[PDB]
Amino acid sequence: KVFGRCELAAAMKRHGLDNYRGYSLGNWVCAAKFESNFNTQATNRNTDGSTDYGILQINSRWWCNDGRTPGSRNLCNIPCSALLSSDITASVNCAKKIVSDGNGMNAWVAWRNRCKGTDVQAWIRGCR
Ligand SMILES: [Cl-]
Ligand SMILES: [Cl-]
């Protein structure tokens, strides 16, 4: 599923990401744009051998199991493939754990490099 921008904002708000750990909804939408281009099916291998999965590019070294990342933890207790669903529920629940872990949204490299410090509210402007 390639989400539309407002469509993703709606789904993230429904699942309770707006202001979760103090991050406004446009932070989450901006993270998704730059991590996955709003594509639930996105996968990208990282230099360390892990892979990032789904709409928020959640990593196989710590958060989900893909069965090919030595030293994997699976702190969200999910197969990584479940993060590619057209339904974002598992991705959102796992992102909640991630963002609660200590460094907040800085856990998302694309957020830190392309969203943090910018006008993130622009990402939900025009949406109902
Ligand atoms: Cl916002
Ligand atoms: Cl924070």
**How far is Cα 89 from Cα 46, in angstroms, rounded to an integer?**
24
**How far is Cα 110 from Cα 78, in angstroms, rounded to an integer?**
23
**How far is Cα 100 from Cα 55, in angstroms, rounded to an integer?**
18
Experimental technique: X-ray
Whether 52 is a known active-site residue: answer yes
Which is the catalytic residue, given 7, 18, 48, 52? Answer: 52
Which tokens go with 10?
């709606």
Domains in the chain: ranges and CATH: 5-124 (1.10.530.10)
5-14 and 25-36 helices, crossing angle to 10°: 130
Query: In this structure, are residues 44 and 66 in contact, taking their beta carbons and an 8 Å threshold?
Result: no
Residue 3 Cα, ligand 1 centroid: separation in angstroms? 18
Whether 7 is a known active-site residue: answer no
101 has binding-site annotation: yes
